[PDB]
Nucleic acid binder design. Structure first.
Ligand code: NA
Ligand code: NA
Ligand SMILES: [Zn+2]
Ligand SMILES: [Zn+2]
Length: 327
DNA sequence: CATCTG
DNA sequence: CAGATG
């Protein structure tokens, strides 16, 4: 946690490069365990020979750790840090719609910058284009003050669209955070569940309003359940317009919300812990449900949930306000 | 994972 | 349909 940091950090460096730059999924994958293993490893790694001892770690890496130990830097890492071609990728990747795959391409096409983009605005895809258009805003964090404004508006129309809707903004925003990356809203309806066949409108329904009323400006992907879009708080008294922030609406079966709602809220770590103990009280929980573990090694069967309160209760645990849901 | 692209 | 992205 600070005892074999830089080493973990460079391994990570190496890992990401290989993956995104070249296609070293394996090497990449390697970098990763390695960085994962030294991560837990309780001692002061005073050598590669000592590293290697480790599992996942072998011959190549130790070369590296040693150099980093011996001297304060990695030549190959240093040599990587400069290469424009590497840098372009990691940079283009910065776009909403630009994965390393597309990154790699454009670069080999000369497109290496933001301007390049605009120029060759044709070679971008839709998503790809919006990400460009909102390149900056998209990189802008969302301060709670804005979040509640938004949250408010969302909730009022989901209400109008139909009174039976159960929307819920999760995330850290829910975890009580001061700034959130995007608005990730949970959606269900009574009339939507596990077995209940389809009902796309359940989603498209709302997607309109929000648009209808200018809340949503652009769609990034719109389907029956998931909607990946862009929204905007109506710039008040003209002199200040907000940014375009990312939003995501997902329609879920009423029969498996609070499991999801719970789930999505985080933090990962809270999850893990609740998930381990869950395992203790004789259960398992997942992104959709909670069920009874048969001794046979394992077993199914969905437990019914009317609230986060149902779930907690189950594994017999202190209901934790979402504020105190960090770790 | 669900969506879009080609 | 694989393959990409998020
Ligand atoms: Na990207
Ligand atoms: Na393949
Ligand atoms: Zn030690
Ligand atoms: Zn999100």
């Amino acid at each position: 946690e600070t005892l074999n940091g830089g080493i973990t950090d460079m391994l990570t460096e190496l890992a990401n490069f290989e993956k995104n730059v070249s296609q070293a999924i394996h090497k990449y994958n390697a970098y990763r365990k390695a960085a994962s293993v030294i991560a837990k490893y309780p001692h002061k790694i005073k050598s590669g020979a000592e590293a290697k001892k480790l599992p996942g770690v072998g011959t190549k890496i130790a070369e590296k750790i040693d150099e980093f130990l011996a001297t304060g830097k990695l030549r190959k890492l240093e040599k990587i840090r400069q290469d424009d071609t590497s840098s372009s990728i990691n940079f283009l990747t910065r776009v909403s719609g630009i994965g390393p795959s597309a990154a790699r391409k454009f670069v080999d096409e000369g497109i290496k910058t933001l301007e390049d983009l605009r120029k060759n605005e044709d070679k971008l895809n839709h998503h790809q284009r919006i990400g460009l258009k909102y390149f900056g805003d998209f990189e802008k964090r969302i301060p709670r003050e804005e979040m509640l404004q938004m949250q408010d508006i969302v909730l009022n129309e989901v209400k109008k669209v139909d009174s039976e809707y159960i929307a819920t903004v999760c995330g850290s925003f829910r975890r009580g955070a001061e700034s959130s990356g995007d608005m990730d809203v949970l959606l269900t309806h009574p009339s939507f569940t596990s077995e209940s066949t389809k009902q796309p409108k359940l989603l498209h329904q709302v997607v309109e309003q929000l648009q209808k009323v200018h809340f949503i400006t652009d769609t990034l992907s719109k389907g029956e359940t998931k909607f990946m879009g862009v929204c905007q708080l109506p710039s008040k008294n003209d002199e200040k317009e907000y940014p375009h922030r990312r939003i995501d609406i997902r329609l879920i079966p009423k029969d498996q919300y609070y499991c999801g709602v719970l789930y999505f809220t985080g933090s990962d770590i809270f999850n893990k812990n609740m998930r381990a103990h869950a395992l203790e009280k004789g259960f398992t929980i997942n992104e959709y449900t909670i069920r009874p573990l048969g001794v046979t090694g394992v077993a199914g069967e969905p437990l019914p949930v009317d609230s986060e309160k149902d779930i907690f209760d189950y594994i017999q645990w202190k209901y934790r306000e979402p504020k105190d849901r960090s770790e």
